[model samples]
Target chain A: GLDAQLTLVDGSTDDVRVNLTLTNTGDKPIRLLKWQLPGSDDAPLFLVERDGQPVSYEGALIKRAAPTDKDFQLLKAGQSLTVQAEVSGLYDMSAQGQYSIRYQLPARSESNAITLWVEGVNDERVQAGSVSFSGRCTNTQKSDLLTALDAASGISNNASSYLAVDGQRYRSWFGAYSSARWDQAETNFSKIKDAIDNKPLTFDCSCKQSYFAYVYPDQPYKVYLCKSFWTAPVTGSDSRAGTIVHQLSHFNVVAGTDDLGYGQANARNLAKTDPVKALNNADNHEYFAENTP
Target chain B: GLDAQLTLVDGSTDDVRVNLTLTNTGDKPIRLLKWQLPGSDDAPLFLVERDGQPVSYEGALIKRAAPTDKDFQLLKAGQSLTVQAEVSGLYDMSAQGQYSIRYQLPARSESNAITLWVEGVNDERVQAGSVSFSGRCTNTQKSDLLTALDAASGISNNASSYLAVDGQRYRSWFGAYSSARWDQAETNFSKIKDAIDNKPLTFDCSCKQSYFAYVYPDQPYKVYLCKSFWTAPVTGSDSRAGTIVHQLSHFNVVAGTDDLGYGQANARNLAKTDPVKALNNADNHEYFAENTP
Candidate 1:
């Protein structure tokens, strides 16, 4: 005979861990497959639920080459073995709600279900920059500018989305600094957005220039567009929207500048050699904003 | 004729930024390749040094097609264009000492050399945890145990090595939480080293157990070896040292546990689903230690 008892280890982290003890209750020694116990390669060995619906198993389901003597652990009568297991990773316990879990054996044995509550991660959206338009502009120029603004907004939104889901990739955009500053990048992105949404925008229709656009370091928040702004493509590589992102980065709010160079290759090159400048570069921002993953 | 002037943008960051102004000095308008300007793709446009030794270029050296009219910027006589460039990323400026930098044009027009001292990154190593040992053991067994302890120590050392250089890979060993805790992992590794180096070590010569080795959750600092432990392999996958690392993780000092199943596959599974639990998993630490890159 066999007896099983399950208990919650503690409620301290998002990943829920539990302690399970299995005792040989009969008069004779019994052989139990190690897979039948917790901490084994075999998964889907437990039934899990979130809210009131069944939670899906997220762990690997192994295909074994049949069990052998090495696969079994012999337990003498009255002997007990205890194991600890984390459940959140193995099941769909992602929802922020009530959860119930129980160990289920193929031999018709089941442990009592334990109830726990999961409080999910924080995804609070911060305020964006304020923006307005100035300078002589045509109706078509205004539309193009507005479209580019939307794209610029999309870049910040897109880049920030990876912060929570794909942080490693997001972190790579700046540099490979172990002391990588996430708050600085986050604050920079927010400031970029704020400058777009809350700051003054301009389109210098009459001025001819070699560069696409430029911003004064002293008055960085106010973007001054040149004739190149109208001719530049609204979307794609080195788009007008990316230019906006580049200019916004120069502001005191963001503090990024024209570092090593412009364009994607130079931006990436700067990231590898000097992380701080890469983060500070206006071109790097435009590149990331234009080529966001 | 063309005149070039170089000036330090500011002495605020490690990645040094400087402003370069190119003015058309002759009456006739001059056409300059866009690549000749700072912030363009062309590199090796400067002479840099740390102390008195000449520094090596670190940025990409591109081979381009023949220049066209589109690649040239026409500068009328008396007109000047200024661009800002960061140097540390493009040259061997990693050393923390005095530095000299200047812009060198192909036309042999050299800018004034400006000297600036670079305050380098901090790589202060923290003190390691203390460790010691206990129990009855034969000479060979004692040597074997010591070897395992050394291996365990190496795991912590090697893992920490990746922290400064290859942080992305180091961070990946834990769960991919954007809120991924580094100090906690750093502290955990330090505690693990301390437990092995300063805490008591043991060789349970008489212990006849099914598992390799174990520790009391309450008295986690102390490790108890079983017959399986002595018989287990000294190095490679699931090695004795890895087991020690696994056991040390269970201690309050590290606060990790067997939240999932044992071995590399299960540990990886735990990491993907529940990063918190994966970080907590003893098997995960063992896997990382044995298979360190």
Candidate 2:
């Protein structure tokens, strides 16, 4: 067995370096698996996330590596392996914010949490650029949606004048549609309500998925589901909180991160079917706005 | 932090109803995930395994539960949740031997091990029906096959009447194949050998499985991996080590129990590409004779 410890090596300012060490203390050798980005071009998989969305390194999109067995590292009995990297994008891309920087180690079936910040990074300021309102912090104002999403997440754009700007993109959509939804009448769940059902998690949808579309073959209910939270299908799979959040963001609602592109179409498909998928498109930004439901 | 305890509730003899209880010693609310099969027309997410292969119920094949969110139980802060199921496959189907019965909990990301025996169930006896062998227990049987297989595994079937036989149907098959396999050139590994690759476990192969197939994309090697004893692929995800073993049972010859069905046409397709799949197929008996490469 191996022990994994994750700590912020030095986030002394906006740039945070992470240190991940796997030490096998047991008497047996450990066959460990490691992950890397495709055309990360010999880049490190320090896969750093601010809030739940992955940060873009210097703005270069991260690609999912092709399937391969070429990189197999062995931790002989009583050995240790360390993966370290100085993650870019912690501060440069975001608003003056407080962020939770976490390390993802899917190989070990583990994700670790540590804190990082963008202390003096963003002197961000913006005007909602609409029938606007102003606050001492900045002219840009976000609705309850962005605030709740950021609060439940790690740190926010509080540190910067660099907050998300909708201009008039989403506010009109918000006023045009009431937040009410009626995909399935019987088991109605809202953006903030927990989806409820009376059946056990079945096969087809492995328990390993954190979010997924649950289709009740016996009943006619096809619902979107997450671990303890769920909503009706905004898309075919009701279980996708990440995609739903991003879609919300476009409605000028800030769901995942301020920036968005629905991850690679194929990646989102993989994720819709199997929530454990790593999306190269969204950057986990959809996950940033994901809530309990 | 939470502690999980699973204990056999009855059937001191042959059957077992495992009582899985979770006591939240931690201060926060915890959401727990559990599994069931699709119809009784589906099977059990019961998913019981020995070492790493799936074990079936007598005349009872495992089924995937009909999809539902009813059973995704949640444990409130400081609360305790106890789930007791008279699991159908704990015993009643295998040979009389000691088995390490483990409970597979995907949501909790944990697998707990305990000992279970098929002793009284199969006071089981055998005769090759041919005078072609010599061993202390079976009177000189076993060619290179069982010898190498047993040599690579825990304890040799040689120690006692302890040998593997599938009812009386395939006794001759055992004596017939000496199990002398020179699969490929030989980095050479027995079940005891740890196949080591120095590269990292790349992407597209999300390392989320308990069992999976590790493909050497950049390299030409394809590996069947597990986490605990693996050298690792468990699920369809490389993070998994479960289905990966069953896949190995076919390709490299590892995982599963002894029979083999790889799964449904579509199901098999999924595994063929991903390696970490859940099969409504395969009795897993092929894994019975696999030798390392």
Candidate 3:
């Protein structure tokens, strides 16, 4: 039988690593055929379960494989393959809730039920609270974000890899969007480098003007998110992550430019980071954003 | 019976204007339901006939009407409406062959096939010839451009109001990849002004890289055109003319910095014209390109 369980790896510096463990329990050895990722890596996705019940997500974007290699790796009896994909990139695990996750691989792997409790949020929004440091919770389904606050977390996680090369670009790209107190920055990153699980993520759409995510700063974060982002599906596009990353500024970091230019002019800020380096990198590249394919 | 014919308007210069004439042959008044144009207009398409035979040149784009309001004007007995839309923008109408043009407006139109002889292409490639005075002849089903040489002319016309005053942002936004000599620009433009024919043409898809007509700058002209700009359908979308304009650059301008740094490093050269002014205008407008309805 193919079985899976969510695992949280605690690394130095308050960083938490959420991973999926796929184990082989049958007597015969199994060959691993493929392990594809979404739009490269920046846009990662998740399949979910809650309180022991399978909670189907908008699965179109997540199921397609980008890296299906011929790795006849034999998983003999009791052997396991640990899939250490970033819990954040895969889902919004920020809500301090209970959920379950399974590594999305072929052969219908099974995973024991799991639970999670973030106990951290709005720390930046309302200058909310930040609990005392204690680490690692089980790999949970980072909410396929059933609501706006939930959607905001997914958007936050999505921005991390929007095409940051490695987690290296995360701080610069996102940091610019934040104030001196940007809290979530160093935490989720050290665990996984980029949207790249193993490789890097690429943008699929470049006619990008807001990835149309916050649907163009629609001039206020709470409104766009609570109304649109929460109502829309993952859109399951490889561009999804980058677009969200770009819009996170509108919802999470600052309000739209219309209301005092609170850093909502992201491309300008992104340009402030470099110039065509970030603009062209964000607009002309092969790996993310752009409303058109 | 409804019939259509291709018409050419003689101009002061050696240039000729291409048009379509639709006639109502029946007695009773008709509603003329659909007046759709390509991608609205950004993606205008054409329908052609050769030697009185149904010659399909992927007109899927030209025929759609972005605004099919009520002319309500009955095509009274012996009446006809002369429609002088950009034949090239509607379809590849420069190859010097026999073809016919008609109103995409419901079933109420006639005309003789038309013919076009550029006698000027690659004229710049080798600085060939600008041939003397002569005007539009008959119906010529323009080659949906099977090559870049052919691709350039098509691209030139495709950008109708890429961003011209909103749509004002249309040209530079499109001109880069074009092989240096952008002929026919000023002349045709004064006639149409903006994408606002009755109404404006907006881009249905912003994720657009090429709608990808110019998919790649396989350049020096003969390049990727064997790929068919005529074969694929107008790819029904709202991206319309704006979408078409964006892709036109890849096919018409030099290459972007990414691809051998052809003149397509659009931002730099567009800056040559005036910066951010045109870009944001094009990027944040209401109709055309930046596909996000």
Candidate 4:
């Protein structure tokens, strides 16, 4: 027989770690598969709930081989083994709310539920080494960035068609060229608008980095804006607002889009050749937001 | 009527910035296009050379309409205006070598060349905030990372077929199923191997980040590995070495691949549906590196 207990370690805005202790309560020692332990691998071993709603697991669904003797570990009577799990991104605990986690061991007892709070991007404290845009940028650059965000927020969803600069008009979101895809763009832009309105991301001005702007796929809430971001005219086809939308597409809060390629030419060409990728491309999102007049 | 001069401001390995000054030497006022200034737009206005070899420009090639009166600026006699440019990413200056930058104005005039040195990553000083693996990781985590890198470096060029776990043998890199694509994989893997060997990347171990691993497209020389990167088996179909290869594929030094969704299923499906995108997909690269026997 085994007993389980769960403890919350750190509940930082981004990092949510918990320790799970498994104690052998029976007189004899028991064998448990290592994979069955919490945090043993990326497999789903927890029942996660955010504000009473079930949270979806976002980790890899690994295909594994049958367990062998090496995969099992012995727990001596009256002894306990402690394991830890980081549950923030693993189970979509990203929304600002209360979260409850319980380790589930099939055919065995479940661990006690542990609760934690996830702070919103706006309310999160700027911890050591992590910076807020206001703290890291000059007044002028900060002003420029907020101005760009304002422009990004001003994107209208009433447009009926895609307008190219050469007086050409197309009726497509990718190559689908349908009103349905147009509706999808509107939906996607709404998410981007929400991120701009509320998501106060960690900021860095690495002016020497080669990209105009960048966001780490792992840490999409943080952004690095380079010299090109500041040097470009803040209002044009490739405006700061366009760049903002492009980078935000890579963030999970937005659409988590991919970098199919760069430039208007590439976006249009991809739309023609491979509509699937074009819809997922960052540049396509940029052009859609920029060219919608 | 115009004289030009170029000055180097900062020559850090990743950030290369310069100031360009255009002075009016004529007795009469002259009109000049604002777009002609260096760093005015993402235009080709500089002649960049790395160790005596000409470097290619990598910025966006924007198409525009005819210049209007508002696009021009008045330059009075004896007056001068200075503008700045960040040239590292714009002009392929990532290699560690002596670099020369000159502001080119087509047939009009060229600014004097300015030279600077780019230090290699191994020799670069670990600046404040920006961290190295040795500084940010624990001894055990660092040891684990180095071990993974060793496994990544051990990927051989002798593999001739794709080995899926289901005893399935596929003959394609993407869906091309051709020998040419196989040759391309060998070439791409060689680049990845070179990166692991000499490219001492700036590392960050942010266990909180959502994704397994990530790199900024603009700052591909830096990588952030998350908790999953450490939790995964060091040798498998989705091993730490496979993740390393996947992230490195996003760097300019490699093939600069794109994310086309995650998982083995998505990768194989993309290969069947869109061979073009599958060739450029990061997961495809990871599966190829991991599954190669």
Query: Considering every candidate listed, which one attains the maximal TM-score?
Result: 1
DockQ of 3: 0.02
Error of 1 at B232 (Å): 96
Number of backbone collisions per candidate, in order?
25, 95, 100, 2
CAPRI verdict (incorrect, acceptable, medium, high) for model 2: incorrect
* Model 3 chain B weakest lDDT span, ten residues long: B129-138
* Docking level for model 1: incorrect
- Deviation of model 2 at B97, angstroms: 1.7
Cα-lDDT of candidate 4: 0.62
| Candidate 1, position B293, lDDT | 40
By lDDT, highest first, what's the ranking?
4, 1, 3, 2
- Per-residue lDDT tens digits of candidate 2, residues B1-293? 67666777654334455777667778877665444211221123344555456654321111111224664566677887776654433222334455555544434334366666543222112111111111111111112212222232321122111232212211211222222312211111222122111211111221233323333111211332223223322122221222322322222222222111122232334334432231212211122222111
Report the lDDT of model 4 for residue B269: 80
Best of the two (1, 4) by TM-score: 1
Q: What is the interface RMSD of candidate 2, in Å?
A: 20.7
Per-prediction TM-score, chain B alone: 0.50, 0.33, 0.32, 0.49
Q: Write model 4 residue lDDT over B113-161, tens digit each, in one string.
A: 9987864233222222222441134324544666677676664232222
For residues A1-293, write the lDDT of model 2, one tens digit per residue: 66766776743344455677777788876565444311122222444455567543321111122223544456787786677655442122344445555443434234366665543223222111111111111111122212322332221121011112211211111112112311211011122121111211111111233433222221111122223222332222222333333322221112111211122333334434433222212223233233222
lDDT of 3 by residue, A1-293 (tens): 77766776665322235676667889887765433322322222355544555432211111111122352356788898776654433343343345666555553233453455444232322121211110111122122222223332354445444533233343333434343213333223312222222211111121222213222221112112222222344533323333343343322123211111112233335445643333222221212222222
Fnat for model 2 comes to: 0.00
lDDT string for model 1 (B1-293, tens) is: 88888898755335578898888889988888777677634256888887888865544322222345787888898988888887764565645788999887632168888898876432221014322233323324444666777777887677656443423444445767453455556667777777766665433333345556655443435566766676667766667777777777875545546435555666676667777777777776767666644
**TM-score-sorted candidate list, best first:** 1, 4, 3, 2
> Per-residue lDDT of A109-215 in model 4, one digit per residue for the tens?
68899887765233223222222451124324544666676676564231222221112333333775656655665566666766766665555553354447766
